[PDB]
Amino acid sequence: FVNQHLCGSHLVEALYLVCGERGFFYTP
Amino acid sequence: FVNQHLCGSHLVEALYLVCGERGFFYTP
Amino acid sequence: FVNQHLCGSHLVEALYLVCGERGFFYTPK
Amino acid sequence: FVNQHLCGSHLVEALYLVCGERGFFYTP
Amino acid sequence: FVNQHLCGSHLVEALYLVCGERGFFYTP
Amino acid sequence: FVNQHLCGSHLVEALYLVCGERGFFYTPK
Amino acid sequence: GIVEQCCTSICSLYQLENYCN
Amino acid sequence: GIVEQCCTSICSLYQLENYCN
Amino acid sequence: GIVEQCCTSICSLYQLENYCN
Amino acid sequence: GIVEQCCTSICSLYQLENYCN
Amino acid sequence: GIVEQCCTSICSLYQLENYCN
Amino acid sequence: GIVEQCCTSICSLYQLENYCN
Numbered sequence: 001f002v003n004q005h006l007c008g009s010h011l012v013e014a015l016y017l018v019c020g021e022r023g024f025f026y027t028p
Numbered sequence: 029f030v031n032q033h034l035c036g037s038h039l040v041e042a043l044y045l046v047c048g049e050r051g052f053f054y055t056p
Numbered sequence: 057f058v059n060q061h062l063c064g065s066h067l068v069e070a071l072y073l074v075c076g077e078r079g080f081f082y083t084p085k
Numbered sequence: 086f087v088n089q090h091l092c093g094s095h096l097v098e099a100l101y102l103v104c105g106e107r108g109f110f111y112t113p
Numbered sequence: 114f115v116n117q118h119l120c121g122s123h124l125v126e127a128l129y130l131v132c133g134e135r136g137f138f139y140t141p
Numbered sequence: 142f143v144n145q146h147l148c149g150s151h152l153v154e155a156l157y158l159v160c161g162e163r164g165f166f167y168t169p170k
Numbered sequence: 171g172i173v174e175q176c177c178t179s180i181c182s183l184y185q186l187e188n189y190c191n
Numbered sequence: 192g193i194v195e196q197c198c199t200s201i202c203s204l205y206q207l208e209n210y211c212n
Numbered sequence: 213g214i215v216e217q218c219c220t221s222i223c224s225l226y227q228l229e230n231y232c233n
Numbered sequence: 234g235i236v237e238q239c240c241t242s243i244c245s246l247y248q249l250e251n252y253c254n
Numbered sequence: 255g256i257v258e259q260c261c262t263s264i265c266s267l268y269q270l271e272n273y274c275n
Numbered sequence: 276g277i278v279e280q281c282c283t284s285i286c287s288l289y290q291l292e293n294y295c296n
């Protein structure tokens with residue numbers, strides 16, 4: 001199962017939304 | 029405005045995919 | 057162009073994340 | 086779990102698409 | 114262009130949901 | 142859990158992005 | 171609710187439509 | 192094609208089903 | 213409604229929260 | 234990191250804010 | 255097929271490209 | 276930046292790869 005890959009997909013979307021103009025690093 | 033917001037949502041999606049275990053830096 | 061439809065798709069996702077256990081109502085129209 | 090959180094994300098998109106003009110309540 | 118690119122992302126998810134076990138063929 | 146369903150949703154978004162102008166054929170099972 | 175019905179097993183679009191307003 | 196049909200104006204789930212296998 | 217308020221100018225999370233149950 | 238922290242148990246949007254820039 | 259190949263273990267982008275037209 | 280480069284014309288995944296860590 002590709003659980004961690006699917007989770008990350010959603011994490012990045014959530015970060016995009018919450019962080020806004022601040023941006024973010026995604027460092028898995 | 030909203031068009032840029034929606035574009036960035038998809039940019040983050042594509043970065044997640046192409047960057048893999050490297051991750052990425054998103055800055056608007 | 058389907059701009060409002062694409063906007064709606066993203067609004068629904070944002071409401072899902074913001075609202076948590078409260079949930080939300082996406083009104084008709 | 087995260088499982089259910091991620092499933093919920095997909096459920097809301099499916100309802101968005103199925104319900105179209107009617108809208109919907111999401112009450113988890 | 115970008116608009117069509119963003120639209121297509123959503124089109125593919127809608128076809129995924131509509132088509133179920135049938136799958137689908139996508140051409141731009 | 143609906144594992145394969147949620148996986149498939151992401152598979153098709155990945156195919157969309159990787160395939161670009163070629164498009165793709167999603168034929169599960 | 172919808173999570174228990176549709177996260178345990180795949181709900182069809184017809185099944186999901188029951189949740190529309 | 193599908194882009195010209197469904198990106199200009201909203202396609203119903205019925206119209207989309209046309210592209211299913 | 214939400215489309216009118218949030219589909220030209222971006223709604224913040226605070227603004228979106230106004231649409232939670 | 235974020236995956237250890239948030240793929241195990243759900244992180245709220247407020248929790249995820251710690252990973253912002 | 256693709257679900258068997260790519261939902262069990264992560265598929266690379268090259269592996270996914272097999273399913274391009 | 277990325278928005279400048281990629282929201283006004285399509286960026287391939289190879290172009291996007293410039294923004295990987």
Ligand SMILES: Oc1cccc(O)c1
Pocket residue numbers: 020021222223224225
């Ligand atoms: O990212 C954002 C969020 C809210 C308003 C805005 O102009 C930008």
Ligand SMILES: Oc1cccc(O)c1
Pocket residue numbers: 005006009040041042043044045151152154155158
């Ligand atoms: O960001 C992405 C893009 C494509 C598939 C996926 O699971 C995540």
Ligand SMILES: Oc1cccc(O)c1
Pocket residue numbers: 092095096099130143146176177179180181182
């Ligand atoms: O049973 C489900 C769960 C998530 C999305 C969907 O379309 C159906």
Ligand SMILES: Oc1cccc(O)c1
Pocket residue numbers: 058061102120123124127196197198200201202203
């Ligand atoms: O016409 C469209 C375009 C994109 C998604 C969708 O559900 C319908």
Ligand SMILES: Oc1cccc(O)c1
Pocket residue numbers: 017030033063066067070218219221222223224
């Ligand atoms: O104004 C908007 C439109 C779509 C998503 C979002 O987070 C904000």
Ligand SMILES: Oc1cccc(O)c1
Pocket residue numbers: 007008010011014073087090239240242243244245
């Ligand atoms: O803990 C998580 C994991 C993925 C998405 C999200 O919003 C929260």
Ligand SMILES: Oc1cccc(O)c1
Pocket residue numbers: 002045148151152155260261263264265266
């Ligand atoms: O193996 C997979 C499954 C889902 C998305 C992806 O990019 C790869």
Ligand SMILES: Oc1cccc(O)c1
Pocket residue numbers: 035038039042115118158281282284285286287
């Ligand atoms: O140029 C772009 C804009 C948004 C997503 C993407 O994959 C490419």
Ligand SMILES: [Cl-]
Pocket residue numbers: 001002003004005006264
């Ligand atoms: Cl994985």
Ligand SMILES: [Cl-]
Pocket residue numbers: 057058059060061062201
């Ligand atoms: Cl529209």
Ligand SMILES: [Cl-]
Pocket residue numbers: 034035062063119120
């Ligand atoms: Cl969009």
Ligand SMILES: [Cl-]
Pocket residue numbers: 142143144145146147180
């Ligand atoms: Cl499943």
Ligand SMILES: [Cl-]
Pocket residue numbers: 006007091092147148
């Ligand atoms: Cl998922």
Ligand SMILES: [Zn+2]
Pocket residue numbers: 034037038062065066119122123
């Ligand atoms: Zn979009």
Ligand SMILES: [Zn+2]
Pocket residue numbers: 006009010091094095147150151
């Ligand atoms: Zn998912």
